[PDB]
């Protein structure tokens with residue numbers, strides 16, 4: 001049963017200057033979000049949904065990590081496969097949630113930065129857990145991106161981002177695919193990390209000057225494979241999806257895969273897109289998923305917010321087999 005959580009961000013300045021009202025209420029204890037749908041017309045209308053965890057505008061980066069990821073990180077160290085993806089409207093915080101930011105000036109080190117998000121926190125903590133256990137581990141990471149249904153490789157040594165990968169069926173495996181051409185960097189220890197992400201960032205920046213609406217329109221899959229010793233392999237995909245408001249084929253297919261999965265029909269159209277193929281095992285496969293849905297408090301965003309909470313809620317019905 002894929003775990004589904006909801007995080008809502010603080011108003012931004014733009015919103016504040018617009019005198020925006022909040023339409024969203026977060027009750028952690030009841031694990032409920034409930035939205036105020038009636039406007040000036042009906043003041044009592046509300047839509048209310050129940051999720052596995054709920055995180056409010058107040059919620060800090062460390063709280064998301066603590067609640068969502070450690071339980072997750074603990075089953076990859078046990079040799080099981082774990083996806084976490086971020087779903088929602090452009091502007092609502094899925095990048096801030098999977099990656100995070102760096103606090104102005106210095107004031108902090110990437111390892112301790114408050115605005116640090118999941119990927120930095122997970123990577124960083126995969127050694128302090130495995131190093132302190134004094135066992136054998138090798139961790140490697142890869143980061144690709146889907147745009148207009150073409151795969152690009154942000155970690156590749158090639159100096160040019162626009163060189164495209166290709167995908168074929170794993171010669172031995174049913175639900176997996178192989179990405180032909182995809183660089184996988186070995187990460188030897190904590191101090192190699194920032195360096196890699198900083199390079200991924202730079203290539204990502206170039207990608208944005210090259211392609212239209214690259215940030216909002218593109219999917220990003222950061223994978224982390226861990227090797228342990230009989231040997232055990234843990235593997236964690238951290239997926240930051242394109243905006244849900246939205247060439248978009250991978251997003252459609254994603255909907256249709258879910259929708260087919262919960263209505264239980266015979267052919268789930270995984271194949272009909274790139275993302276659903278890379279991610280096939282994460283939807284009704286043997287991977288243990290989570291979906292952090294991402295929403296905004298403002299009244300302006302109401303229609304989109306329900307749309308998210310609706311979509312995210314159905315997903316609670318999808319059943320895996322780890």
Ligand SMILES: Nc1ncnc2c1ncn2[C@@H]1O[C@H](COP(=O)(O)OP(=O)(O)O)[C@@H](O)[C@H]1O
Nearest residue numbers: 008009010089090091092093094095096097294
């Ligand atoms: N939980 C949060 N706390 C503080 N600021 C946030 C939060 N979520 C988003 N923001 C800010 O809102 C803006 C949009 O965030 P971003 O992650 O780029 O959205 P998305 O990636 O889903 O479009 C950024 O300025 C980001 O810093």
Ligand SMILES: CC(=O)c1cccc(C(SCCN)(c2ccccc2)c2ccccc2)c1
Nearest residue numbers: 099100101102110116119120197198200201
């Ligand atoms: C792929 C990528 O760019 C990335 C992935 C995870 C974290 C980070 C950043 S945040 C990227 C923009 N959202 C970062 C690294 C290097 C320079 C600037 C930022 C990161 C921030 C804080 C702690 C570690 C890493 C970046």
Ligand SMILES: [Cl-]
Nearest residue numbers: 025026056057
């Ligand atoms: Cl709240």
Ligand SMILES: [Cl-]
Nearest residue numbers: 062112113114
């Ligand atoms: Cl911190």
Ligand SMILES: [Cl-]
Nearest residue numbers: 167168169170
């Ligand atoms: Cl094939």
Ligand SMILES: [Cl-]
Nearest residue numbers: 313314316317
């Ligand atoms: Cl339902």
Ligand SMILES: [Mg+2]
Nearest residue numbers: 094095215240
């Ligand atoms: Mg984003």
